[PDB]
């Protein structure tokens, strides 16, 4: 065996939705190891399945190494081994630091590039299906040493078959983090047989993540403190009903500070946010369009 047999766990990172994450050592390198119990095989298998999708690898998608089993002599462990990113999540990174205009662009553009890749179908023998995340949030995006992001936590993802316009696991129920659920997800108006609706719901979530980044953009020593979207309107761990009353009924979105009109980069960011936040998913920007706009911005700023 070349994987779990040869890995040594060094540090507990944390227990998430399913399983637990550790920092391990594999062939002298640091690796992220997500371990699931025998009764979590369905979650482990589905995440292994998404990460093994043909042509998935991309600089802005977490690098998957292997799936494996490890028997310690008492119980079986189901492992998912991936690249290790020392900064941890974009949520941790934005809490820990402020960012420059350059830093903000790198973070936003890389996030959009990874999402555009996830969403994009690549047609061919070695084809890649279009994939929707369903749980995009700052806690599910990692920050690499080079200051760019990679999308992680692909366990809840759905894959599209374009010839039939059907989804591989035919989702029939709401999933994901309540705070980041699109208005159509919160009010259950979403058509879950329509794959394009899942892509649009991801864009709404990315708009919220962009708002979190922009708050941390420090110009002339001026920035906002770290906050989750809707910090001002809902409790921690909000319910679907608490979110639905704010997002769907009162029709509120995170506030856009007046100061974001002070420079081109914050005006471009604020504009993308508004265009991800439309209640009508069909009116939202695509990840590919956002990538295009941000790459044009990155060129002007000389990143």
């Amino acid at each position: 065996g070349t994987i779990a047999r040869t890995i040594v766990l060094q540090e507990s990172i944390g227990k998430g939705r399913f399983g637990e994450v550790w920092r391990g050592k594999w062939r002298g390198e640091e690796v992220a190891v997500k371990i699931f119990s025998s009764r979590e095989e369905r979650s482990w298998f589905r995440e292994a399945e998404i990460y093994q999708t043909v042509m998935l690898r991309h600089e802005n998608i977490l690098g998957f190494i292997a799936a494996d089993n490890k028997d310690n002599g008492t119980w079986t462990q189901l492992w998912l081994v991936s690249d290790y990113h020392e900064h941890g999540s974009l949520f941790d990174y934005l809490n820990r630091y402020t960012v420059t205009v350059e830093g903000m662009i790198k973070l936003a553009l890389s996030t959009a590039s990874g999402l555009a890749h996830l969403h994009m179908e690549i047609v061919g023998t070695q084809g890649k299906p279009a994939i929707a995340h369903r749980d995009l949030k700052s806690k599910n995006i990692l920050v690499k040493k080079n200051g760019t992001c990679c999308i992680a936590d692909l366990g809840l993802a759905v894959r599209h078959d374009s010839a039939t316009d059907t989804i591989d696991i035919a989702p029939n129920h709401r999933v994901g983090t309540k705070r980041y659920m699109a208005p159509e997800v919160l009010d259950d108006s979403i058509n879950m047989k329509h794959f394009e609706s899942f892509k649009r719901a991801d864009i709404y979530a990315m708009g919220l993540v962009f708002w979190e980044i922009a708050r941390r953009c420090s110009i002339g020593g001026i920035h906002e403190d770290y906050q989750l979207p809707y910090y001002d309107l809902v409790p921690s761990d909000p319910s679907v009903e608490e979110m639905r009353k704010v997002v769907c009924e009162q029709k509120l979105r995170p506030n856009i500070p007046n100061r974001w009109q002070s420079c081109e980069a914050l005006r471009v960011m604020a504009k993308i946010m508004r265009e991800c936040w439309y209640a009508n998913g069909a009116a939202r920007l695509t990840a590919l369009r956002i990538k295009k706009t941000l790459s044009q911005l990155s060129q002007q700023e000389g990143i």
Side-chain angles (χ1 to χ4, degrees):
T2 61
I3 308 301
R5 178 183 70 86
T6 73
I7 295 170
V8 175
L9 308 173
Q10 300 170 102
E11 183 178 14
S12 170
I13 291 164
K15 195 182 189 68
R17 202 183 291 272
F18 295 93
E20 183 187 347
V21 185
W22 296 84
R23 177 176 58 94
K25 204 178 274 178
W26 183 51
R27 300 161 73 184
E29 303 191 75
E30 305 301 329
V31 296
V33 180
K34 190 167 180 183
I35 304 170
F36 301 77
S37 72
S38 63
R39 63 177 175 177
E40 291 177 307
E41 191 194 316
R42 284 175 68 85
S43 291
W44 165 84
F45 184 86
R46 177 56 173 177
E47 195 171 334
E49 182 173 49
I50 299 297
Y51 279 108
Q52 290 178 49
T53 297
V54 173
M55 289 289 297
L56 180 62
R57 289 176 76 83
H58 188 270
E59 74 181 300
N60 307 119
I61 294 290
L62 176 65
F64 175 74
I65 294 168
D68 203 3
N69 285 208
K70 196 177 189 167
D71 190 335
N72 62 15
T74 304
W75 65 96
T76 293
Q77 301 165 23
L78 304 174
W79 283 36
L80 294 181
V81 185
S82 62
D83 295 347
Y84 174 77
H85 298 293
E86 202 182 322
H87 287 306
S89 70
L90 176 65
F91 172 85
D92 288 356
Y93 191 89
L94 296 169
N95 268 275
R96 192 174 301 122
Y97 310 111
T98 58
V99 301
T100 61
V101 159
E102 170 165 83
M104 166 180 70
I105 301 154
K106 293 176 73 184
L107 297 169
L109 174 56
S110 55
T111 298
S113 297
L115 194 69
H117 174 74
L118 203 67
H119 284 186
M120 175 180 94
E121 181 181 19
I122 309 166
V123 179
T125 302
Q126 293 298 325
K128 179 192 154 287
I131 302 166
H133 195 282
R134 299 199 300 171
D135 191 22
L136 191 66
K137 52 171 181 193
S138 60
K139 282 177 187 219
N140 284 347
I141 297 165
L142 303 162
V143 183
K144 305 183 153 187
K145 192 199 163 261
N146 69 358
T148 70
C149 293
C150 63
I151 301 178
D153 296 86
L154 306 190
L156 286 172
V158 291
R159 306 185 287 181
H160 187 221
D161 182 63
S162 59
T164 60
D165 195 8
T166 61
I167 304 160
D168 65 336
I169 59 166
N172 71 350
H173 63 277
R174 182 168 44 218
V175 298
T177 306
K178 290 156 177 70
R179 181 182 300 277
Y180 293 84
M181 286 177 181
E184 62 277 17
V185 170
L186 293 167
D187 69 10
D188 206 26
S189 64
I190 188 160
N191 179 2
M192 288 187 278
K193 294 190 177 294
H194 186 232
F195 180 79
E196 196 59 36
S197 293
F198 286 113
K199 280 174 56 184
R200 297 156 177 185
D202 279 353
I203 293 291
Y204 165 89
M206 192 168 75
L208 298 179
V209 170
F210 279 18
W211 178 91
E212 295 177 63
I213 302 170
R215 287 184 66 87
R216 300 307 277 164
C217 180
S218 189
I219 306 158
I222 306 158
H223 52 266
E224 293 73 46
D225 57 18
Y226 176 84
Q227 297 295 349
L228 276 157
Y230 304 104
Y231 76 100
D232 49 354
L233 295 158
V234 308
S236 302
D237 201 17
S239 70
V240 164
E241 283 301 290
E242 288 167 335
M243 287 315 305
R244 192 194 49 80
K245 293 173 174 188
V246 165
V247 176
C248 303
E249 301 187 66
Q250 200 176 168
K251 299 184 186 300
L252 306 180
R253 293 297 182 274
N255 282 316
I256 298 302
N258 43 24
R259 69 157 280 254
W260 293 1
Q261 289 298 297
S262 73
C263 76
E264 191 66 25
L266 292 166
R267 290 189 302 263
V268 172
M269 286 289 285
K271 184 176 199 276
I272 289 157
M273 282 167 223
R274 284 189 287 274
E275 297 168 5
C276 292
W277 291 349
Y278 294 129
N280 177 6
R284 299 176 194 142
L285 296 173
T286 65
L288 195 68
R289 175 50 54 181
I290 292 169
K291 179 178 179 182
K292 279 168 187 186
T293 299
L294 290 174
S295 60
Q296 277 183 21
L297 180 60
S298 174
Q299 286 185 307
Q300 289 157 23
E301 306 287 340
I303 319 305

